[PDB]
Every structure is written in structure tokens, then in C-alpha cells.
Amino acid sequence: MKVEEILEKALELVIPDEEEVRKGREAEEELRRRLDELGVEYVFVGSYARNTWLKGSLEIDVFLLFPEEFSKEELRERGLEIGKAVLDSYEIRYAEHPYVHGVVKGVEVDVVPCYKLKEPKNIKSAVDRTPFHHKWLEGRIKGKENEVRLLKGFLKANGIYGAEYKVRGFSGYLCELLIVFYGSFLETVKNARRWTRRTVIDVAKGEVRKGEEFFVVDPVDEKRNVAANLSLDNLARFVHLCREFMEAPSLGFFKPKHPLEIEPERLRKIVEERGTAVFAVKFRKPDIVDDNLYPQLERASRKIFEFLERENFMPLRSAFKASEEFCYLLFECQIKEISRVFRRMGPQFEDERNVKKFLSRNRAFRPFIENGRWWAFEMRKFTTPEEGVRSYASTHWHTLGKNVGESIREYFEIISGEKLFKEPVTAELCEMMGVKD
RNA sequence: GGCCCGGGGCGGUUCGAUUCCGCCCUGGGCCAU
């Protein structure tokens, strides 16, 4: 029931069991055979090759080494060729460049093409660096794999384990580097409590210093930041999580938090107790990869939020959600309605020129002098958040992300009230408002 | 696709805009895959 003890039972949650490993070995086996009966120059990398793969997330990554001189196209053509001839099933996939995805003896496999190079510089694609990361990482991680797993388990369980844009957390490489630095999960957690947004971790120099931003410098590339895509808040959440784990160790930290739905009737009551405005902007999901959708949703949500605050509606928090069919931009505002008149600051009284122009615009309610300068009452074109957003989205759709914006321009609607709790956005909303229970 | 930095034109808004809201082309850097 204490630190160690818990970490004991925890392994049971993060370490792949015999049959899962056996499935993987036999798959690795076959794969190696097929690549040889064709005699290609390949190298297995990633967590499978270093036995740092988290339980239930088996996936083999085979990198195909190609001569420097080979043209970009040759790598991909031949890359696809090899993948097809060795994979039971094959489905081309994309990233920096196209690669191949499939299955062998029932396990996931990624066949990527890269340049067999020497020494970190000369790296052409990002994937060209992976081979190095593997070299640098294999000798050093040995005998600590289970540590890399506890860490991956911890993060994954609190939704901060991926480094892709839909998570902005810790990548698997970052995780090992951490273990290779602190020595184990417990040490990583223990020290993480003292981490700050100005913390720099230089693996290669075994040093920790103060920088301008959280920076884990790549053993292979001193300029590169491995935690480049880790959000300031996710950084913060982890530091807070580690502080709690040490405070009250628990096996719960390794268990995926239960979905915990809420009846739409309880949610309506809560919004009533909060007396706020709760609405969402719905639109068709652009058929694009997640790495493109979310950075866009984030922006879209940001722009409308910012429109909301300068517009005086006192937004409290924003939030977004994507489904197979639509995307929802959720908001909560302190102001359900606002007067139609508002005051506009004008020039200082002794500026005859500007004052004259200021008083030249005919308005309905006659400007006045207050504390040295002129003011005018003006009228709003809208008086509720929803009204304003309907106005904003219609005219600034183009500012919400290339794709998200093209979708909103063609179709969008604002939901709220009962009709909104029907939508598949209750968790995000509960998450947004800190609903607890 | 998104973020950062920087140029050249514009639009709207405003008494007043390089300085708010945005659109054109445009240069470098970074991120996820």
C-alpha cells in the first residue's frame, strides 16, 4: 500500500504478458524472414525493438535503409514495393512522406523508408533521425524497460501520453530519455515535482538548467527539443500529478479514468445554478487527419473566445470536440445578455479638431464630457453571445483554420439549452465546468 | 495543416491605426505524422 508496493501491482498493468510477447516475437520472426527472402537492408526500431512497448500496444516498426544518393521518389516507390510483398495486408499511410502500414502474423507493423546515414547532420527527413535515436537509446535503456512502462502507463492513464496534436503530451522517446536520466519511474516522478516551465534537461550532459522554455535536448541533436510539442498545461498537470502520487501513492494513477457520463437532466440544473450562457458551434467535420483537425479546432475555439471577451461577454472557458460526423466548439459565458448601449471613448476636450469630428457622427443619444474627455453612447449590433458568434462565424469563417473554416463557411449552427445536452458533448462540458462527482 | 518571427501591398472599424478586426501575395524558423 506504499510507493514500491503500488509500483509492484502496477507492472501487471503495463507489462505485456507472455502470450502478447510471444505473439510479437513470432511476428517479428516471420517479418525478419520475409525481408530476407527479399534481402532488404532493414532495422527494427521503436519500443518493440527495445522492449519498452506498453502493454496492449504492440506495434513493430521496420525502417528500410536506403543509400544517400537515392532520390526521394525511389525511397517511396521501392518502399511501397517492399511493404506490399511482405505484408499480409497493406494500407499506404502518410506523414512527412508516405510509408506503409500492415499486419504480419496478427500484429501491427510500420514499414518506413529512410536514408542510411552516418552522423546526425545530413538528416534529410525527420524519420532519418529515428535510426540514430535507436542507436543512442538501445545500449542505455537496457534493464530499465519496465521503468519506461510504468512511466508510459502513468501518463497514458491521465491522458497525457501522446506527442501528437490531439494530446500534446510526452512522446515515447521523451519517456525513455527521462528514464535514462533519472534512472527509473520513481526518480522521474520524484524530481518532476520540482520541474518548472523554464526547466532544461540535457540528457547528454547529465545536466539540468534554467532556460527560456521547458527543454529536453535531444542526445542526437543539441538544437532539437524532444518535448517540443508538450503543452504548458500538460507539463503543469504532470508536475501536479507527480506531486500527488508521492503524497498519496495509489494504483489508481495507472487506471484509465472511468468515462463517467451524466444524465442531461443533472447537467441542465447545473447550468441553471451557474446562471451562465452555454452554447456550442456545430459544423461538419473536415475529412482530414487529426494532426490537422485539432490544431485548427484549437484556433477556431481561440478566435471565438477572443471575440467573446473583447465583445464583453466574459467567456469563462472554451472547449471543442470531434466526432465521426461533426465538430463542436463549446463555450460558457458569464453574460447571457448585455445592454444595447455601450460607451465609446473619444478625444480629450481641448482637441478642437478631433472633438469636432467625434461630435460630427449623428448618434441617437448625444455624447457627454467626463473627466476631461468626451464620450458617446453607441449601440451594439447584438446583445447575446450566441447572436455575436452567429455574426462572427458568418463573416470571419476564414480565420478559423483553413479546413475548419471552409466547413463553417458552408454550414454551421449554434446550439444551446436542452437541445445542446442531447448532443455528444456532455463530458467535455462537464470537464469544462469542473462538474465533480 | 498549426505555432513563432519578418517583409509588401490592401479592406473594414475608429476622433485618431503601424498600434484594434481581417484579406491578399511574400521571406525564414519550428511542431505532429
How was this model experimentally determined? X-ray
Q: How many domains does chain A have?
A: 4
CATH assignment at residue A421? 3.30.70.590
CATH of the domain at A39: 3.30.460.10
Q: How distant, in Å, are the alpha carbons of A75, A126, A305, A336, A435 from that of A427?
A: 44, 36, 20, 22, 9
First to last CA, chain A: 25
Q: How far is CA A364 from CA A311, A343, A377, in A?
A: 21, 12, 8
Domain boundary among A94, A128, A143: A143
Quickly tell me which residue has 449601440 as its cell.
A379
Written as one letter, the residue type at A300 is A
Report CA(A299)–C1'(B8) in Å, whole number. 26
SS3 string of chain A? CCHHHHHHHHHHHHCCCHHHHHHHHHHHHHHHHHHHCCCCCEEEECCCCCCCCCCCCCEEEEEEEECCCCCHHHHHHHHHHHHHHHCCEEEEECCCCCEEEEEECCEEEEEEEEECCCCCCCCCCCCCCHHHHHHHHHHHHCCCHHHHHHHHHHHHHCCCCCCCCCCCCCCHHHHHHHHHHHCCHHHHHHHHCCCCCCEEEEHHHCEEEECCCCEEECCCCCCCECCCCCCHHHHHHHHHHHHHHHHCCCCHHHCCCCCCCCCHHHHHHHHHHHCCEEEEEEEECCCCCHHHHHHHHHHHHHHHHHHHHHCCCCEEEEEEEECCCEEEEEEEECCCCCCCEEEEEEEECCCHHHHHHHCCCCCCCCCEEECCEEEEEEECCCCCHHHHHHHHHHHHHHHCCHHHHHHHHHCCEEEECHHHHHCCCHHHHHHHCCCCC
Residue A184, annotated ligand binder?
A: no
Of A52, A37, A152, A48, nearest to A108 (Cα)? A48
Query: How many angstroms separate the CA atoms of A61 and A131, rounded?
Result: 11
Amino acid A303 CA to nucleotide B17 C1' distance, rounded Å: 21
Q: Are residues A311 and A379 in the same domain?
A: no
- Grid cell at residue A224: 532539437
Q: Are residues A187 and A323 in the same domain?
A: no
The closest nt to A298, taking CA to C1', is B2
Nucleotide closest to residue A404 (CA–C1'): B1
How far is the C-alpha of A162 from the C-alpha of A170, rounded, in Å?
Answer: 6
Say if residue A161 is in the same domain as residue A90: no
Residues A229 and A355 in one domain: no
Nearest nucleotide by C1' from A165 CA?
B32
In order of A69, A112, A115, A155, A367, the CA distances from A122 in angstroms are: 12, 18, 10, 34, 67
Q: Please indicate, yes or no, whether residues A200 and A309 belong to a single structural domain of this protein.
A: no
Residues in chain A: 437
Q: Which residues of A204-214 are buried (b: 16+ CB within 10 A; e: fewer)?
A: eeeeeeeeeeb
CA A70-A72-A74 angle, 5° bins: 60
Same domain? For A50 and A139 the reply is yes
At residue A312, φ and ψ (nearest 5 deg) are: 75, 30
Q: Which residues pair with A280 in a beta bridge?
A: A330, A415
CA distance A435 to A437: 7
Strand B CB shell (< 7 Å): A 93-96, 126, 163-165, 171, 224-226, 228-229, 291-292, 295-296, 298-299, 302-303, 306-307, 310, 344-347, 351, 354, 357-358, 360-361, 376, 396, 398-399, 401-403
Domain match, A317 and A409 both: yes
| CA atom of A345 to C1′ atom of B27, Å | 39
Q: Specify whether the CB–CB gap between A99 and A111 falls below 8 A.
A: yes
Residue A161 marked ligand-binding: yes
Residues A69 and A111 in one domain: yes
The alpha carbon dihedral of A202, A206, A211, A216 has a sign of: positive
> Looking up cell 479638431, which residue turns up?
A353
What's the CA gap between A195 and A208, in Å, rounded? Answer: 10
Chain B bases closer than 7 angstroms to a protein Cβ: 1-3, 14-16, 20-24, 30-33
Vertex A228 angle, CA A222 and A229, to 5°: 160
- Strand A89-93 relative to strand A99-104, pairing: antiparallel
Q: Per the annotation, does A133 bind a ligand?
A: yes
* A277 and A333 belong to one structural domain: yes
Judgement on whether residues A106 and A241 belong to the same structural domain of the protein:
no
- The letter for the amino acid at A242 is C
CA distance linking residue A323 with residue A321, whole number of Å: 7
Of the residues A228, A259, A290, the one at which a domain ends: A259
Say how far apart CA A320 and CA A328 lie, in whole Å. 5
Protein CA at A103 to nucleotide C1' at B30, angstroms: 34
**Pairing outcome for strands A373-379 and A368-370:** antiparallel
Q: How far is the CA of A295 from the C1' of B3 (A)?
A: 9
Q: List the domain range (segments joined by +) for residue A356.
A: 340-383
CB atoms near residue A155 (< 10 Å) = 24
Domain boundary, last residue among A128, A143, A158: A143
**Residue A292 sits in the same domain as residue A432:** yes
User: Residues A221, A182: one domain?
Assistant: yes
Q: Distance (Å, rounded) from C-alpha A247 to C-alpha A190?
A: 10
Query: In the structure grid, which three cell numbers stand for residue A139, read together?
Result: 545500449
The strand pair at A326-333 and A341-348 is best described as: unpaired
Q: Give residues with Cβ within 8 angstroms of A98, minimum separation 6.
A: A76, A79, A80, A92
Tell me: is residue A353 an annotated ligand-binding position: no
Closest CA to A322 of A291, A299, A302, A293: A293
A110 known ligand binder? yes
